[PDB]
Design a binder for this molecule. Sequence first.
Ligand SMILES: CCCCCCO[C@@H]1O[C@H](CO)[C@H](O)[C@H](O)[C@H]1O[C@@H]1O[C@@H](C)[C@@H](O)[C@@H](O)[C@@H]1O
Ligand SMILES: O=c1ccn([C@@H]2O[C@H](COP(=O)(O)OP(=O)(O)O)[C@@H](O)[C@H]2O)c(=O)[nH]1
Ligand SMILES: [Hg+2]
Ligand SMILES: [Hg+2]
Ligand SMILES: [Hg+2]
Ligand SMILES: [Hg+2]
Ligand SMILES: [Mn+2]
Length: 263
Amino acid sequence: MVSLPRMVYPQPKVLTPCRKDVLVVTPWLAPIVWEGTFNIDILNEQFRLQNTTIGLTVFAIKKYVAFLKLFLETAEKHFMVGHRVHYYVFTDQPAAVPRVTLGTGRQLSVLEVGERRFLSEVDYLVCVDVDMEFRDHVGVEILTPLFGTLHPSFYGSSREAFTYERRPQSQAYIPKDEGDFYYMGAFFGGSVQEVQRLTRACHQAMMVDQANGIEAVWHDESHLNKYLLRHKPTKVLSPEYLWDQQLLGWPAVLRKLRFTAVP
Ligand SMILES: CCCCCCO[C@@H]1O[C@H](CO)[C@H](O)[C@H](O)[C@H]1O[C@@H]1O[C@@H](C)[C@@H](O)[C@@H](O)[C@@H]1O
Ligand SMILES: O=c1ccn([C@@H]2O[C@H](COP(=O)(O)OP(=O)(O)O)[C@@H](O)[C@H]2O)c(=O)[nH]1
Ligand SMILES: [Hg+2]
Ligand SMILES: [Hg+2]
Ligand SMILES: [Hg+2]
Ligand SMILES: [Hg+2]
Ligand SMILES: [Mn+2]
């Protein structure tokens, strides 16, 4: 709404693309987020002027509570620093959640397991796996109504090789001649409204499948892929945002490894 203040930064050059080695915009005109495609100062200004609050949700059930300390401490160094952040930790062991020191404007809620809340508390929801650590900047460049992340093992694969659910009997079914990308279930998000629409659709689809005695090959991730095929994401995150260095190394196409699998 409000005007940006005067800012001094390099002029963007029309006849000079930032990245020539990768696709930076999808066929439906959604940016694909890679290092070099965004000026974080301009984006931070835009989002701070709106007093943006980001919710970060993670599940830590059974032995996975062990991953919380590193996850949260690294999120404090790299995730949305400067912005309001609300962590939501869903766990079966509330007393096992580590006591992590948080920066100002950041809070954590422990929710025991064994909603309209989000609508009134945050503007965007980011949903990720907990067996991970942040190694570099993950900020407002990802925020948009609905986003998915390119799975690190398939970003260079032909659609026929994607491990989508291939049985027509499943709600997650995607035939061999369809598909844009293979999105990983470990990192998705968007506005609260869009994330709840997505989770509701996948939940209903999974219930239909269960009633028909079938379980999608990659569970929730198969359904996330069917949803994002039919409801195109407004931004797509590159594999910089979901990487496994032990498994895949550090390819030239990745200028930064931002959020990675814990060995
Ligand atoms: C040594 C195991 C190799 C797995 C590589 C492909 O990753 C898996 O892809 C499937 C879909 O085909 C699922 O998305 C699954 O969750 C992925 O495995 C997980 O992510 C990879 C990157 C790696 O960190 C594995 O250890 C994870 O289990
Ligand atoms: O005992 C378990 C198994 C899974 N998870 C949660 O479900 C996510 C998906 O599981 P996992 O990381 O094992 O899957 P992978 O990335 O290996 O495919 C984990 O990050 C956790 O957030 C959990 O909390 N406890
Ligand atoms: Hg979520
Ligand atoms: Hg998640
Ligand atoms: Hg689901
Ligand atoms: Hg989903
Ligand atoms: Mn995981």
